[PDB]
Each structure stands twice: as structure tokens, then as C-alpha cells.
Amino acid sequence: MQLTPFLILLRKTLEQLQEKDTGNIFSEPVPLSEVPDYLDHIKKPMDFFTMKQNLEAYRYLNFDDFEEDFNLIVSNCLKYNAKDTIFYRAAVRLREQGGAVLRQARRQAEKM
């Protein structure tokens, strides 16, 4: 694990985003065994574990690329699930609570 201020900030931000997912429903890839048609509709699955692996492999080089993968967690969920579902309501909540986390983190990244 390589240590730079930027990577430490992304590590901290990822932890703050996962803290908002109190049910851990976005912690790991959507289980394709339970959902055989998921890849028919979703082109780029995303979850917080995949993000952590991307981060630890030093594959997020800028804040934009990190935030883009977070936005996929949300947008994939809203796309696949009906509005009256626990998952869709959870994605809406994550979008709201995670947006405030990202705003403050992005401001700190811009000063690097």
C-alpha cells in the first residue's frame, strides 16, 4: 500500500461513503448467482469492494475517476431496480448522503 496525501484522502472518503451504507448492500458486487439477468442491463457493475481494490492497486489517479465509480454504484442500482424497492430507496439515500461526503472531500483534493 503506497502512501500519498491523495491516496489517504481517498481511503478516508471511501470509508465515509461505506458508513452511509448502513445495510452493507453496496459492500460487494451484486451477486450474479442470485440475479442471472443483471449483466443484461448493467454494463459496468460497481461496489465498494471493487472500489477499494482499485484504490489499493493505485488505479484512481484523480478524484474524478473515484467519484465516477461511486456514481455507478448509485446509478446502476436506480437503473436495475423498481422505484418501490428497498434497494432503490437505499440508492437515493446514498446519493444524497454520499454527495455531501464527496463535496467536502473534493474540496480537500483540489488543494493538493
Ligand SMILES: Cn1c(=O)c(=O)n(C)c2cc(N3CCOCC3)c(NS(=O)(=O)c3ccc4c(c3)CCCC4)cc21
Ligand atoms: C439485485 N440487487 C441489486 O440490483 C442491487 O442494487 N443491490 C444493492 C443488491 C444487493 C444484494 N445484496 C443485499 C444483501 O447484502 C448483499 C448484497 C442482492 N442480493 S440478493 O440475494 O438478490 C437480495 C438480498 C436481500 C434482499 C433482496 C435480495 C430483495 C429485497 C429484500 C432483501 C441483490 C442486489
